[PDB]
């Protein structure tokens, strides 16, 4: 299953990104169409990288495309990059930020609140928080005390209004999940969880929502 992200640029343009789970690595393709203001090609620098991946024509100069690959065993991470014309000028997003794309997790959907499973087996997470400026998801394995997997949520892709959401291909090897709001690393319980764990007074007061 592939995921697609369309970013508006700061020079009235569009950058298209696709992340594919190649049959155990990851492939990211970048496509930049249109040409009004920049002519002489672009180089994809990974957010200040001294190296560069030049974008080659695809179908006769209408579009410029590049491809990047990533080795497996990498926990869910983010790819950040910038674009540069043959002048030194930098192309950013319409929010004046580097293009950031998740690799290893899907965008998810804001409904229903809590944890739900789709027909294909994808696990969707959704939680409401108006005041929190950063939300993180923790996954725990059968014992846990420390997270086996930690996933920060992108404030742009993983939000719809005041609901933070994320999708996971599979939760195999995990039994519990929790949320972290703000910068505090204290795991919180999902208000909409239907099955919960054990109330453990750590040395604190914590309870984890079950993934069953």
């Amino acid at each position: 299953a592939r995921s697609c992200y369309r970013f508006r640029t700061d020079d009235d343009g569009v950058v298209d990104v696709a992340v594919s789970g190649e049959d155990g690595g990851y492939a990211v393709s970048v496509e930049v169409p249109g040409t009004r203001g920049r002519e002489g090609g672009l180089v994809l620098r990974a957010s200040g990288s001294g190296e560069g991946v030049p974008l080659a024509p695809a179908a006769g100069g209408a579009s410029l495309a590049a491809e990047l690959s990533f080795d497996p065993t990498r926990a869910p991470f983010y790819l950040s990059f910038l674009l540069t014309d043959a002048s030194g000028a930098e192309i950013r997003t319409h929010r004046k930020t580097s293009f950031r794309v998740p690799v290893g997790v899907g965008p998810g959907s804001p409904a229903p609140l809590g944890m739900s499973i789709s027909g294909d087996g994808a696990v969707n997470f959704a939680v409401y928080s108006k005041n929190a400026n950063a939300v993180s998801l923790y996954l725990y394995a059968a014992a846990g005390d420390e997270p086996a997997l930690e996933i920060d949520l992108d404030p742009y892709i993983h939000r719809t209004g005041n609901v933070w959401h994320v999708s996971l291909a599979s939760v195999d090897g995990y039994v519990s999940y929790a949320f972290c709001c703000g910068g505090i690393r204290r795991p919180l319980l999902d208000p909409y969880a239907k099955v919960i764990g054990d109330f453990v007074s750590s040395n604190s007061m914590r309870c984890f929502a079950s993934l069953a």
Binding site: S109, P110, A111, Y128, G161, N162
Partner: protein
């Protein structure tokens, strides 16, 4: 329903028609039912509370037309939760009355230009919560605002009963599309003045389809029942009016380029200064038909705007800034394409040079019913 449209059709916001009805009380709270009757307006209506504080709907654009046909009128007092925006009809009335020339509207006009803080600041809302407009789908178009003194709704079949009766318009001297050259020149000036007033105000500007080329409906100010070219966008007539379209495009570009035009907070006195015929002496008297201001810009340095809604021409004095001089940008009185100066014009430097004997001594001559915009540039 609102959540469905947002999450399935990717709609960015909503505008609610006759939104005051959504604040009237339900009959379930009468003492007969439990143990203030039906339709009494409430200060905290449950539906508005649910919409404003929804996890999804609370972060989208919500605009209310704050009146209904039952006599309610809640402009400036809609229950907003500091979240809701409003169609500003007081702005519409004040601008329509000032631009055509009417005693006692200069202070209201200056308040309109600043985002109407007298309606929004105390309650905790921002200038951009005000949706400014001059014309809409209901009522006169921009072209008919300067052509007719009264509605012509006889084609509706209701014996001229339907439609707004107080349009606050002026036909610029003669009634109808057949007039002398001076009247047509004045009409073009007035349309440009309306667009300039819209584009330099604090708040969110809104204008109707086809107002950018001068669409006309023949004086009919309520055209709800005509599937007919009176309601169609005229792409053929748009090409005959490329000058007004160019002016509107350039003015929108100018608004986008200036950091002092769309502000996140109400302008302060250290940034904005009011002027009159002479700099630093604004005229708020009842007979005044002249408003001018200058504001500090982090991009263009300083800009100066003046509106002369009088029937008499005037030469105005410009603020004194030693080491700098004022450069002309906009003048709605000048014939196109010199009503807006761009570097695409090959005659720009020469046209500016021909007014140097006025610009050097900080003066500018204005026609009646005209507007100007100037920029400050270093001179050494």
């Amino acid at each position: 329903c609102l959540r469905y449209w947002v999450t399935e059709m990717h709609v960015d916001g909503f505008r609610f028609d006759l939104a005051s009805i959504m604040t009237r009380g339900c009959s379930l709270w009468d003492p007969v039912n439990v143990y203030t009757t039906t339709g009494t307006p409430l200060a905290t209506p449950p539906l508005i509370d649910m919409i404003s504080n929804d996890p999804i709907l609370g972060d989208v654009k919500l605009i209310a037309e704050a009146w209904d046909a039952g006599g309610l009128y809640q402009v400036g007092q809609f229950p907003h939760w500091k979240i809701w925006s409003e169609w500003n009809g007081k702005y519409r009335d004040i601008v329509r009355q000032f631009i055509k020339g009417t005693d006692g509207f200069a202070g209201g006009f200056a308040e309109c230009l600043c985002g109407s803080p007298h309606l929004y600041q105390a309650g905790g809302r921002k200038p951009w919560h005000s949706i400014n407009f001059v014309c809409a789908h209901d009522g006169f178009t921009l072209a008919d605002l300067v052509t007719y003194n009264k509605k012509y709704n006889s084609s509706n079949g209701e014996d001229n009963r339907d439609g707004e009766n107080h349009n606050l318009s002026w036909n610029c001297g003669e009634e109808g599309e057949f007039a002398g050259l001076s009247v047509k020149r004045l009409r073009k000036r007035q349309m440009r003045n309306f667009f300039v007033s819209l584009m330099v105000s604090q708040g969110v500007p809104m204008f109707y389809m086809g107002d950018e080329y001068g669409h006309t409906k023949g004086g009919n100010n309520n055209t709800y029942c005509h599937d007919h070219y009176v309601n169609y966008f005229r792409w053929d007539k748009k090409e005959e009016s490329s000058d007004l379209q160019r002016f509107c495009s350039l003015m929108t570009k100018f608004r986008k380029q200036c950091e002092s035009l769309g502000l996140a907070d109400f302008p302060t006195a250290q940034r904005l200064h009011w002027h009159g015929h002479q700099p630093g002496k604004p005229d708020w008297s009842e007979t005044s038909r002249f408003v001018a201001f200058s504001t500090k810009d982090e991009t263009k340095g300083e800009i100066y705007v003046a509106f002369n809604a009088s029937h008499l021409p005037a030469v105005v004095g410009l603020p004194e800034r030693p080491g700098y001089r004022w450069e002309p940008l906009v003048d709605t009185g000048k014939p196109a394409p010199y009503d807006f100066l761009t570097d695409d014009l090959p005659d720009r430097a020469h046209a500016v040079h021909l007014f140097s004997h006025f610009l050097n001594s900080n003066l500018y001559p204005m026609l009646s019913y005209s507007s100007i915009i100037l920029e400050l540039q270093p001179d050494d």
